[PDB]
Ligand binder design. Structure first.
Ligand SMILES: *[C@@H]1O[C@H](CO[C@@H]2O[C@@H](C)[C@@H](O)[C@@H](O)[C@@H]2O)[C@@H](O[C@@H]2O[C@H](CO)[C@@H](O[C@@H]3O[C@H](CO[C@H]4O[C@H](CO)[C@@H](O)[C@H](O)[C@@H]4O[C@@H]4O[C@H](CO)[C@@H](O[C@@H]5O[C@H](CO)[C@H](O)[C@H](O)[C@H]5O)[C@H](O)[C@H]4NC(C)=O)[C@@H](O)[C@H](O[C@H]4O[C@H](CO)[C@@H](O)[C@H](O)[C@@H]4O)[C@@H]3O)[C@H](O)[C@H]2NC(C)=O)[C@H](O)[C@H]1NC(C)=O
Ligand SMILES: *[C@@H]1O[C@H](CO[C@@H]2O[C@@H](C)[C@@H](O)[C@@H](O)[C@@H]2O)[C@@H](O[C@@H]2O[C@H](CO)[C@@H](O[C@@H]3O[C@H](CO[C@H]4O[C@H](CO)[C@@H](O)[C@H](O)[C@@H]4O[C@@H]4O[C@H](CO)[C@@H](O[C@@H]5O[C@H](CO)[C@H](O)[C@H](O)[C@H]5O)[C@H](O)[C@H]4NC(C)=O)[C@@H](O)[C@H](O[C@H]4O[C@H](CO)[C@@H](O)[C@H](O)[C@@H]4O)[C@@H]3O)[C@H](O)[C@H]2NC(C)=O)[C@H](O)[C@H]1NC(C)=O
Lengths: 13, 208, 207
């Protein structure tokens, strides 16, 4: 899965 | 003679794959007579070569500020590799050396808990929303707040405080107009840290 | 030559009538060849004579540490009187002077709120209890915890943080076994600040 912060990409594992 | 200071990247930059982390070796008191400054950079003792010098900056007190900057890989920094800047200059009988890296220690996951205003606060024009963050290590962390996609800028976060079990905690407090809280608006505490899944978590909060 | 550092009393001392606040003039890097230090104290430019010198103490990097300590009245410190320590030593081209006093500005009363642990927090051996202290000025304060007339020692308190309206806030965190909490015990956050009624308030928290 992937995580975004205010639209911006944080990280994907 | 010249003095040397070496700064880490910013937590957010090391945690967001969409951002570019860098370490910064700043040399001050560089004299008008020997302004030449050599930089050697090492990553775990192995000399890298991709650093860049920033524009020379003359200081109001007759000295130069000379700054080399090294870009770094997210996983290297977070693997806790050691970064060394070595500075040579003619006014400096011996090269100066500095190292930083991530604080060592098993990394621990922040536990993120939100707390609504006290009934005793409900008498006031604004109320406080708290985001308690505890049990995290290292102390490198980003906390921010938001509502409906949009950032809220009216918050303050405490510096990280060392706890009795060897991990850290802090609180972030966002102050908002009572009416905004009564209006049923969801508020969200976003926390970024290397020991979280995808380096990011988000906890929410609103009237019951 | 010598360097000087002038320290304020502890917040708690100035707030309790029972304790004795003091201001403290430290002199470091006094030399072996000239260990004599002359202290002059002034309160609002008016010299006083009642300070006392602590025993001289050798530092082991070839210098002495020389402390003069001045007792102060609670109302005086709180009313924002300025304390001045003038230090003279033969190594000093001119006497060093330092001043300290309470932060200037309208004192403001802390708003004290206790916050229970989250229903998400509740699957651990211990729980966290919060005491949010906001809206106080100056930042001089003391926070302690108690339960049923006994001190609760397992807490940490953040440093005071400057807020956008120019007052401060902090949070104090008490950690207690989940059981002690579930069983309806009452825990108290106690706050001491110059702008509280009787410089003291207590708020409590229970399931
Ligand atoms: C002649 O003048 C110069 C310049 O002086 C400046 O201008 C004058 C007019 C005055 O206003 C000064 O106050 C100005 O500073 C003098 O140079 C100064 O020398 C000082 C020591 O002699 C030195 O002190 C050391 O500072 C460290 C912290 O510095 C931070 O923060 C300060 C302010 O808080 C800031 O001014 C500094 O520039 C420095 O800023 C950081 O820069 C880094 C690198 O750019 C940033 O990190 C990067 O950021 C980018 C994005 O921008 C990206 O995210 C990268 O990934 C990241 O790496 C970082 O964000 C900046 N921080 C901030 C807050 O802005 C102290 O830590 C250090 O103390 C430590 O060491 C001491 C032991 O020596 C201990 O006492 C102490 O405990 C600490 O361990 C030093 O005190 C000043 O910084 C320096 N000023 C500048 C601008 O470099 C010079 O001394 C004077 N000559 C003579 C002969 O007197
Ligand atoms: C020879 O050695 C000596 C001693 O060194 C010690 O011994 C050796 C073995 C080493 O291990 C050292 O680590 C030891 O310190 C050297 O002395 C040092 O000189 C420094 C100057 O270069 C000086 O730095 C300044 O210190 C200020 C903070 O000092 C606090 O906190 C430190 C450490 O955190 C502590 O060590 C000091 O004692 C002092 O502690 C406070 O003492 C006061 C007075 O007693 C207490 O207040 C009173 O408490 C009583 C009851 O107890 C009552 O409540 C009273 O009402 C109350 O007044 C208070 O509780 C103590 N506080 C704490 C937290 O413990 C800094 O603020 C200061 O910085 C400021 O100024 C700078 C500009 O000059 C700025 O850069 C800076 O940003 C600030 O503006 C300095 O850092 C050290 O204090 C001093 N150490 C001691 C013990 O005196 C000496 O230099 C060396 N000589 C040579 C040639 O090398």
């Amino acid at each position: 899965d992937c995580a975004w912060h205010l639209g911006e990409l944080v990280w994907c594992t | 003679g010249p003095s040397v200071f070496l700064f880490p990247p910013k937590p957010k930059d090391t945690l967001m794959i969409s951002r570019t982390p860098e370490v910064t070796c700043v040399v001050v008191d560089v004299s008008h007579e020997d302004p030449e400054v050599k930089f050697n950079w090492y990553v775990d003792g192995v000399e890298v070569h991709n650093a860049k010098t920033k524009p020379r900056e003359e200081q109001y007190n007759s000295t130069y500020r000379v700054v080399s900057v090294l870009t770094v890989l997210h996983q290297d920094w977070l693997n806790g590799k050691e970064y060394k800047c070595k500075v040579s200059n003619k006014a400096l009988p011996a090269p100066i050396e500095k190292t930083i890296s991530k604080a060592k220690g098993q990394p621990r996951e922040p536990q993120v808990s939100t707390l609504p205003p006290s009934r005793e606060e409900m008498t006031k024009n604004q109320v406080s929303l708290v985001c308690l963050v505890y049990g995290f290590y290292p102390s490198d962390i980003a906390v921010e707040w938001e509502s409906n996609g949009q950032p809220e800028n009216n918050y303050k976060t405490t510096p990280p405080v060392l706890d009795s079990d060897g991990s850290f905690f802090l609180y972030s407090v966002l102050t908002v107009d009572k009416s905004r809280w009564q209006q049923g608006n969801v508020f969200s505490c976003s926390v970024m840290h290397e020991a979280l899944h995808n380096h990011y978590t988000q906890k929410s909060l609103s009237l019951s």
